[PDB]
Design a protein around this ligand. Structure first.
Ligand SMILES: Cn1cnc(Cn2c(=O)nc(Nc3cc4cn(C)nc4cc3Cl)n(Cc3cc(F)c(F)cc3F)c2=O)n1
Length: 185
């Protein structure tokens, strides 16, 4: 039962900080993405995110909507998500809300790679707050949603695959579902 993905496809962007790259969600004039993007490969195992944040400037972020670069004019960190303020509002922004779902609820996921939509499928949140998704490498920042009439409810931002092959992430305010932390361990 996956929801049609057209309204979300127009919101996906590629976010690059140095050589680390993942997917971002562009709504109005804000891009949301996992804060993990500010890690170099050596920081990924045990990042000090407050320190890494101090060291970055707006011009260290490259945001691409397709072949169009968007100018970053502000950035801030909210729990495990980074919010990049860009100088252009997304003209395909749908009506949307952010919601936090519970175990047992289902949602659709738009898997993206390097900012480009790749597939859509339905998932359920398990009681241990993991999901059995279909995510490959490069899918970090892909989002889960439901459609509520005309309104897109965003409920899941993908961060990591765990050793057993299931997946974990945050709501759109950056709070993990479950007892996980955004580090490569
Ligand atoms: C197999 N699989 C299924 N889902 C995933 C999701 N995922 C991902 O796509 N990427 C990750 N690490 C990165 C490596 C990078 C190399 N470059 C050049 N840029 C990169 C950017 C990322 Cl995000 N990871 C690992 C991971 C991502 C996190 F956000 C986190 F907090 C901890 C982690 F261990 C990953 O799971 N891969």
């Amino acid at each position: 039962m996956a929801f049609p993905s057209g309204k979300v496809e127009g919101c996906m962007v590629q976010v690059t900080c140095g050589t680390t790259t993942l997917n971002g969600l562009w709504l109005d004039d804000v891009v949301y993405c996992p804060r993990h993007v500010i890690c170099t490969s050596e920081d990924m195992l045990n990042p000090n995110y407050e320190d890494l944040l101090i060291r970055k400037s707006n011009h260290n972020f490259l945001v691409q909507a397709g072949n169009v670069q968007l100018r970053v004019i502000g950035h801030s960190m909210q729990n495990c998500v980074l919010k990049l303020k860009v100088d252009t509002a997304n003209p395909k922004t749908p009506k949307y809300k952010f919601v936090r779902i519970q175990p047992g609820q289902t949602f659709s996921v738009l898997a993206c790679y390097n900012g480009s939509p790749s597939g859509v499928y339905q998932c359920a949140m398990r009681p241990n707050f993991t999901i059995k998704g279909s995510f490959l490498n490069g899918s970090c920042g892909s989002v889960g949603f439901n459609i509520d009439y005309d309104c897109v409810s965003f409920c899941y931002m993908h961060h990591m695959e765990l050793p057993t092959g299931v997946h974990a992430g945050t709501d759109l305010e950056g709070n993990f579902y479950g007892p996980f932390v955004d580090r490569q361990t």
